[PDB]
Symmetry: C3
Subunit: 186 residues, 3 copies
């Protein structure tokens, strides 16, 4: 069938805000829903995790198995941004260098958590099995390929691939005009 | 212990067809069972997702977290094909180029979904964390490595790796002799 | 909210041994708890799988989606080791070469399972979306970057990346003084 909440059960979750035509899987996890807000026409699929401060506009699909670790600073997606399956977005990560201790079992004073808001601008697409690390803006109209890793802010309207990513090609801007056409008839 | 459904629970599912000794996780998601056939001696683990048209033969393991998105055209596996953990197989995929809007929140006329049957032939093995794209015939006896990305059909009896995959060596065919012998015991 | 067991429900799983302050998601899967041991201050998140023989010490996070397939020979992590999200550790994998049949639907005669203990020593961290294969000792202090693949044992206090991994730099050892200072103030 499908595993989505009814519009009725959504209201019971306690989101900061949730628009219309919001389909969220019952097999997703939602932690601290009072700091999570969703526009209209959002779909979030089985085995996703939203945890902490996350904000999603409208016309966004968060595909299956995707984790959004919004922490305190948060993750924000703008309209028409989509995220394919099995992606992680971190707004916070532990320091790997060996200069600090690590992870939730250890108190803050021994760790060196790197944290910064993450933003996906309008029309961003994030390819399957990718990772986005903290304190990064993914530019307007940016496509990130499958299995790619992003550690820095990405320039608008390009397609990036690889670990860590590299620019390979301009993204076509035809979507801008299609979005105007779509909005019209809606 | 294990999380597999009963023969009794399995029949309650409504599969287009289910064979014998089928072990399906209660923690998998099965969408539109009505279009899904499974032969004999098949195991499907936790957190898999089968959605839309998916045909599976016999002697096949779909390991944990693997998503098979058959859509309309479908995904087929021949006998002795196996898929290791956290793989995605897409029978349909959105246009990443920027020539078109994307994903299930948006109507089809604004999109440009690529679709085509995906076929895994006999003795195919797909390594963990791999991705197969639409309209791809994975040749008989092909092995694709961990973390593989497959956008195009793959010639029989080869080992491939990488993103996207390249052909690194031949697969031996000794496995065909062992199939014939296994069958002759059985 | 959070999705962990109370310390009461923990005792009802029948681990070879569970310590105190042990947070385990109800959305995780635990097979054969009889051969699994867990020290103290350990968190195991949603959609993890622990199957067969698994030994975790103290001060360890096993992040979401992570799968530890310990089979019979086992996976052992020492204290202050952590695994980030969507990692797989295998103590047994099947032969990809074509010399043998594959997976849990086939009798052992016809297979050529590679087995070998996996050990992660003190302060190891494994980055997200990584894979560690059988018979590998990850030396004390090792860091493996995200989206990496490990088929061989790794030297102490080095940072490794890639598929399969290459050494890129020394790990800083300030973490050795920090554990001292932290353990003391307790
Ligand atoms: C990123 C992508 C769009 C590029 O496809 P393309 O426009 O057809 O370009 P090509 O396949 O010609 O690749 C161009 C270069 O990028 C490399 N490349 C392509 N995809 C890559 C990836 N995901 N990671 C690393 N390298 C990649 C190719 O090797 C090639 O390298 P070269 O120039 O050195 O030969 C596509 O490869 C991809 O990753 N799609 C992801 C689809 C997806 O995740 N869908 C989720 C459901 S909507
Ligand atoms: C692909 C695989 C079979 C190759 O192993 P191998 O035949 O033992 O070959 P090697 O390890 O010598 O590697 C051959 C070349 O391919 C590369 N390579 C190997 N595995 C690769 C992978 N998964 N991704 C990218 N490259 C890989 C090596 O770098 C080497 O490159 P070079 O010739 O340019 O140096 C193995 O690496 C693998 O990926 N196994 C997957 C195991 C799995 O997914 N198991 C699930 C549980 S059953
Ligand atoms: C491994 C890691 C610590 C390296 O970071 P760094 O020390 O800042 O090193 P740099 O980013 O300058 O990269 C050094 C080299 O490694 C390459 N590289 C870095 N990380 C890589 C990775 N994960 N895979 C493949 N290559 C990688 C870089 O391209 C660069 O190569 P070059 O010398 O050929 O240019 C980091 O990139 C990483 O993977 N962190 C994972 C964090 C994680 O998984 N967190 C989970 C939540 S806590
Ligand atoms: C994955 C999933 C599916 N379902 C149900 C409801 C859905 O309408 C139905 C089928 O959805 P589906 O995801 O199989 O098919 P689509 O509705 O076409 O969606 C998908 O294909 C596109 C081409 C990709 N770009 C998407 O990333 C991919 O997830 O099954 C759920 O209820 N929950 C889920 O998590
Ligand atoms: C993963 C999984 C396991 N189980 C139960 C039933 C099983 O008999 C038992 C142990 O299964 P396991 O999958 O850990 O181990 P195996 O049955 O040996 O299979 C595994 O190792 C092989 C070498 C790989 N080729 C497989 O891909 C891997 O999944 O646990 C479940 O009930 N559901 C599951 O999803
Ligand atoms: C992921 C997850 C979270 N939770 C709840 C209880 C937790 O205390 C709360 C916060 O968990 P969280 O994982 O969103 O956030 P943190 O407690 O900061 O943990 C995370 O950020 C760090 C920088 C990383 N090193 C970790 O690997 C990452 O998972 O949400 C659960 O109940 N179950 C879960 O699986
Ligand atoms: Cl996953």
């Amino acid at each position: 069938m499908n595993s989505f909440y009814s519009q009725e059960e959504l209201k019971k979750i306690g989101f900061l805000s949730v628009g219309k035509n919001v389909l969220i899987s019952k097999k997703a996890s939602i932690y601290n829903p009072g700091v999570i807000s969703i526009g209209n026409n959002v779909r979030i699929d089985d085995f996703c995790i939203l945890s902490g401060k996350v904000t999603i506009g409208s016309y966004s699909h968060i595909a299956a198995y995707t984790a959004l670790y919004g922490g305190e600073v948060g993750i924000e997606m703008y309209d028409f941004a989509n995220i394919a399956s099995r992606t992680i977005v971190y707004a916070a990560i532990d320091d790997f260098s060996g200069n600090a201790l690590m992870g939730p079992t250890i108190p803050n004073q021994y760790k060196n958590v790197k944290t910064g808001k993450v933003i996906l601008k309008k029309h961003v697409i994030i390819g399957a099995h990718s990772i986005i690390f903290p304190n990064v803006v993914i530019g307007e109209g940016v496509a990130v390929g499958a299995m790619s890793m992003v550690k820095e802010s990405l320039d608008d309207w390009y397609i990036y691939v690889g670990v860590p990513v590299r620019k390979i090609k301009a993204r076509k801007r035809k979507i801008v005009e299609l979005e105007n056409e779509f909005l019209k008839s809606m």
